[PDB]
């Protein structure tokens, strides 16, 4: 709805990454070897990144576009287009805060 003539690149604060994040992926799993469904906290989890099928909720209680955007009460997924799994990012909270290696090993090291 607006012309974009400008693009800025800047540093992202931890709070900003928190804002982007729909959840913290904890379980270092992909999918169960049987169900092939995204694991609970797994990196593919639908409960955060969104549904694999368009508007079809994970557990399957909500299906069509009728109810839209409303998070279900079972799996906790949102009912929306499956496209979201492309644009929706998570986060991992580190116990000991680490450093972005770019600024460390950059030729004119910025921290240094």
């Amino acid at each position: 709805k607006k012309e974009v003539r400008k693009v800025r690149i800047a540093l992202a604060s931890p709070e900003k990454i928190r804002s982007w994040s729909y959840g913290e992926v904890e379980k270092p799993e992909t999918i169960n070897y049987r169900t092939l469904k995204p694991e609970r906290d797994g990196l593919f989890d639908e409960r955060i990144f969104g549904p694999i099928k368009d508007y079809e909720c994970a557990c399957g209680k909500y299906k069509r576009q009728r109810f839209e955007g409303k998070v279900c009460e079972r799996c906790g997924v949102e009912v929306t287009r499956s496209i979201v799994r492309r644009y929706r990012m998570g986060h991992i909270e580190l116990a000991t805060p680490a450093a972005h290696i770019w600024f460390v090993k950059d030729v004119p090291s910025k921290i240094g």
Binding site: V25, P28, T30, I92, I101, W102, F103
Partner: protein, 283 residues
């Protein structure tokens, strides 16, 4: 500046780092997934033995491992031996690995791209062609212009609607004369771009009028063959079709091989008598 030391590590969406099974019952996945996996693993184990009150040595070492894991996710191989899947030499491609590089998201998936409505083939001499004309193989041209031909089959009877003509063209290639003429009904007046790699001079791409002709070979005018650097030893040339009337306007006007004559480099003529022509006109 303290943002440079990061607490919460951003995680790329599933479809950006996909895992999907192909035909044959296989499974395929991105390396970024494995990287993230080891990262979060070390992180959780860390938190576990940390809050547990384990000895400082193991804790510290785990912190170090967390740092190098984070680095493995950010830029892999930037420090020390790059992390590789067990048994295999190939390093895991991380974020920075994807961004930068010859095949990086810019030089590969941005500054150039694979496009629809296009194809290519071997080239053959154009002695009957006049300049802006180019031989375009029937077969190639039909499937190339399919979205247009569908409309011209919509207007011109024979099948009731789009889907009809579609299925008519797909299965059972009858290619009734009706479609050979209808194709030309949507063709004439519009020109397609012809490209010869390498593209060095801008003249490496020139607008040419499609002419439906037999054979699977593409006919090109002998004069502009000099500009393209092309010959026929079996050289191959690309064909693209401008869609919107705007792009078609640009094509027919300033991209036309007939409308570009002099060399944009030296200002002198580009396509002139060459080889045979010179020989005869001399003789």
């Amino acid at each position: 500046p303290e943002w440079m030391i990061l607490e919460a590590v951003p995680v790329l969406p599933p479809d950006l780092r996909p895992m999907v099974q192909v035909d044959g019952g296989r499974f395929a996945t991105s390396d970024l997934n494995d990287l993230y996996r080891r990262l979060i693993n070390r992180n959780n184990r860390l938190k576990k033995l940390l809050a547990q009150g384990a000895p400082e040595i193991i804790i510290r070492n785990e912190k170090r491992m967390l740092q190098e894991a984070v680095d493995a996710v950010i830029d892999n191989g930037r420090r020390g031996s790059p992390v590789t899947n067990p048994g295999s030499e190939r390093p895991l491609r991380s974020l920075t690995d994807i961004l930068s590089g010859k095949q990086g998201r810019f030089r590969q998936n941005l500054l150039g791209k694979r496009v629809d409505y296009s194809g290519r083939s071997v080239i053959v001499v154009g002695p009957q062609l006049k300049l802006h004309q180019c031989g375009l193989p029937k077969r190639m041209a039909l499937e190339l212009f399919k979205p247009f031909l569908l409309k011209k089959m919509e207007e011109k009877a024979f099948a009731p609607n789009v889907k009809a003509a579609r299925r008519m063209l797909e299965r059972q290639r009858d290619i009734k004369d009706e479609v050979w003429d209808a194709l030309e009904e949507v063709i004439h007046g519009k020109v397609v771009l012809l490209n010869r790699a390498p593209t060095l001079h801008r003249l490496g791409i020139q607008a040419f009028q499609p002419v439906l002709v037999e054979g699977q070979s593409i006919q090109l005018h002998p004069l502009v063959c000099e500009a393209f650097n092309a010959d026929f030893d079996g050289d191959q040339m690309a064909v693209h079709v401008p869609l919107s009337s705007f792009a078609q306007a640009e094509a027919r006007i300033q991209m036309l091989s007939a409308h570009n004559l002099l060399s944009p480099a030296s200002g002198e003529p580009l396509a002139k008598p060459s080889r045979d022509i010179i020989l005869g006109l001399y003789y």
